[model samples]
Target: MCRKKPDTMILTQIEAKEACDWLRATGFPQYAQLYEDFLFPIDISLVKREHDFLDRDAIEALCRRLNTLNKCAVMK
Candidate 1:
């Protein structure tokens, strides 16, 4: 999958991961850090909705913090 950035730049998940890895290797490991706390509390209903049919915008907004994860640690 590819996403179009502001300048018409296209990036895949692998490409984004590579960028994050490079940043970490270059001593900027925190470049992918997230600022806000967890949006979904320990509520089961909220978790269900999050895992189910939330729209792209909602996902994208929350996903901005995904950079902090070790597995998908990247932003484009």
Candidate 2:
């Protein structure tokens, strides 16, 4: 059996930007900003959204893909 191409690709910032609408709608407006900041290099002073302790579970769930993209950035 031959294998189809693996779905081995990372999500890009453009997709990250698109997520803002959903994040904001879902009441994660702060993370919307955080995601944008991580996706696009920007002023670090604005990243005051520390909800990791508050919405730890939900944030982890939503940020899994974003974290992958970010980890790649830092890895390089």
Candidate 3:
């Protein structure tokens, strides 16, 4: 039997919350706070309706920052 893979293109606020929670759980409370700081000013209704708060470029930049942190941790 074959199974369908989860789609990565769509990001919801619920997922964002979970990601924040995961960051907190993983010893990255500062990152979790950063996520909240970025999200808090946006209207929740619009975030839900639009299915995204940050644009692709913003997300990409965030990912790059995360990768840099991960690399630094590995080197230490």
Candidate 4:
């Protein structure tokens, strides 16, 4: 939670974690950002590479391979 503040509103790591938890609980966990005036569903494809779809085993295998190569460091 490295934040640069200009005025007085600055967020700490604990506050960031609390905000994330609240967002997750509220069903806004992976919301998409709007640029123009239209809204779109968040695209989850960024987290899924290689195949179009992945099952649990495939995701686990990908995690294992990534761990061995020091990539995909954020997967659960």
**Candidate 4, 1-76: lDDT as tens digits:** 4575743333433333443454356443542112111333222344346444767665554433323222212221
Q: How do the residues 1-76 of candidate 2 rate in per-residue lDDT, one tens digit apiece?
A: 3464343232454456556766677666765676555544322222225453446566665555346435434654
**Candidate 1 residues 1-76, lDDT tens each?**
3565654343444444554575466444443332122222233334347646766664443344333232232221
Best by lDDT: 2
- Rate residue 75 of model 3 by lDDT: 40
lDDT of 3: 0.47
**TM-scores for candidates 1 onward, in order:** 0.28, 0.40, 0.35, 0.25
Task: Report lDDT (Cα) of residue 53, candidate 1.
Answer: 75
Model 3 / residue 17 / CA error / Å: 0.7
TM-score leader: 2
Task: Show the lowest summed lDDT stretch of 10 residues, model 4.
Answer: 31-40
lDDT of 2 at 14: 46
User: Sort by lDDT, best first: what order?
Assistant: 2, 3, 1, 4
After TM-score superposition, the amount by which residue 17's alpha carbon in candidate 4 deviates from its true location, in angstroms, is 0.5
Candidate 4 lDDT at 11 equals 41
Which ranges of candidate 3 are over 4 A from the true structure? 1-11, 39-76
